Amino acid sequence: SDEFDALRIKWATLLTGGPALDPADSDIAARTDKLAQDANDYWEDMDLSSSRTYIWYALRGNGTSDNVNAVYERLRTMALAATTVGSSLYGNADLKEDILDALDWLYVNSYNSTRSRSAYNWWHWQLGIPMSLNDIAVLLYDDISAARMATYMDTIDYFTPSIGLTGANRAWQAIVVGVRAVIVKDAVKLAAARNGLSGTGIFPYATGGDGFYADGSFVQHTTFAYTGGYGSSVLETTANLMYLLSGSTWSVSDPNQSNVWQWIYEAYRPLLYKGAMMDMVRGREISRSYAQDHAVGHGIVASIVRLAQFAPAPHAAAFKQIAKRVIQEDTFSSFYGDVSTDTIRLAKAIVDDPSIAPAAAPNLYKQYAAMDRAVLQRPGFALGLALYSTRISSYESINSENGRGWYTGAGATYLYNQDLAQYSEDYWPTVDAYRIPGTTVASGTPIASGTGTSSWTGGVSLAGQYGASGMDLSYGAYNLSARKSWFMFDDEIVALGSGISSTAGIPIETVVDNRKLNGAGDNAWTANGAALSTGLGVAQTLTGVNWVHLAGNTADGSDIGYYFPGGATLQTKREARTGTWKQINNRPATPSTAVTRNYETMWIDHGTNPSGASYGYVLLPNKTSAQVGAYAADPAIEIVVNTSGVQSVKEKTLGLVGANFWTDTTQTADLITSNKKASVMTREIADERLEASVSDPTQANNGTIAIELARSAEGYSADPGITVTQLAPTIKFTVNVNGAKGKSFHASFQLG
Length: 752
Ligand SMILES: OC[C@H]1O[C@@H](O)[C@@H](O)[C@@H](O)[C@@H]1O
Prior knowledge:
binds alpha-D-mannopyranose, 7-stranded antiparallel β-sheet, Beta-galactosidase, Chain A, domain 5, 3 domains, alpha+beta, Glycosyltransferase, 12-stranded antiparallel β-sheet, Chondroitinase Ac, Chain A, domain 3, about 25% helix, about 30% strand
């Protein structure tokens, strides 16, 4: 028994679930039956004759990365069904030989060192295929002759001989070099893989470019928010590799590995909602039918469970609590339904352990300044806000993926509630891509993929409880500019727009919402107390509307109210939309099956060539018709200002005042006065204390922000970087935002 021999068995168990895997388990049973079934269909119509010019007719083409890569995945699936306890194909020797022969056929006809290491698509040749190959190698290790194993691992070492990329890609090389190292028992290479994790975009926090940021953000491809896309892969790969090496000669020792624990707390947890990984941070992956939010979420929890196996306390235990909660929260799609059998085994051990209680649900506001994202988590609902600027791009679309993601990150609001299916069930291929909720656009007109021209994108966080965000809008593809702000309070979100001007000669609109409805598309809804028609295919204009209520898809926990201060005119339509994933993902493997979903879409029409137009609306999650009606009668919020210079809102019951200042001039909103671009929020406790949070959203101010609060104080306490120069008769202080990178600075004053 070699050490490598031990590692190999360890990895094999990670793939099959080991010999302990209990096939009596209801969920484990399902996972294997499905694996065996899939393995059969593949084996069944597989071309076995030595004359064959392809393995599977439907995948022929020894020069198409996609096809070849897909052929290895299938072989991988077959190898698993032949080594997983409970599988009807377990041990079947014929199946094993067929897999091996197919592998030989590929080495000769398509996968060998005579090909360009950089031949499109490079990813497939250097990472995708090798990862599948190693897995087969490890699973059929005993049945693989030294001769064959040579042609297998030599080719791999050819394409990927070392580690030198960043983020997800560097991690992928690491798992490729490492797993191969264990197979060919090369201690050098293996030590090389372990060290690769300390590289760019992984263990060490990034200050720019790809990687994880100290504020929890995750970037990939230089300018895209990717926590849920490439980020998922980095987490999965890093967890799998760290677990393999853990407790061995090549165990990870880099001190930065502790940042991995923080990833889970600050980078992932806040973006998870009852099993779903928010689409706003999944990039172009939202266009993948096999990777909708809950499916992706399950993958992330699977990694957390993996980390829980070797993570040091208290982390290990905390990870268990978080996984247990999410597994119990997701009643939409079973967690055990789409993760590895080993994950199921390990997960069940946590859920059935009574000594382990579910973690508390997150309740907070967080500003992901490095990736122009913000998230609000409350009991009963979550709000995700996607923005873009000179630092982050509008959306990514490469390799024929995400062709209609134009506005998915242009001041887009994503509401999460009891309807856990809202963004799954083919939302993306059917939703009107020109009307993404919360955005302001030129009707039916797209924009390009790229960074913006304004740096004012971000917001402030008040003690991680409340917050405000803003985005200076100016599209490049066409003339349209506006100031958009969002104020997040306890149970309402206030959206404000001003300075909406255009010369594009195209109608401009602001999408209040665009929700997928139930199967019948008959959700009930009211306006100003009047029941509205619920028939599909009906468009209608609601004039002089103060409030609207829309019943959700669940009995409770998914209703949404809309309040319009000062009244508004809404353009609406309830229609059935048809689409195909092929339309937004034009790759071979995408199903071209048509699907139909129902929608209720509501927008404000600003007319053509508007000048200084504006809007204001409040989202009231989980309230009944009556409640929304009551609210509109005696609103808790109050619009302090909504000009192109400053947008401010007040929350009378909580004593909160938020303000976004758009220009570098002295301006005043309620009790707040600022001399520069800033996002400010204050909380006043009658004759007790006054709290304030300030941030420089532009991340370009090399000096200070001078703030003045119209209140008299007796004393203070503040974050370093703040200098109070006066407490009476009014409060005055400056904030050193030089190199702050969009962070919030807090100060607390004792009132007379
Ligand atoms: O499509 C091949 C491969 O490309 C990478 O860039 C990522 O998008 C992966 O998720 C994907 O599997």
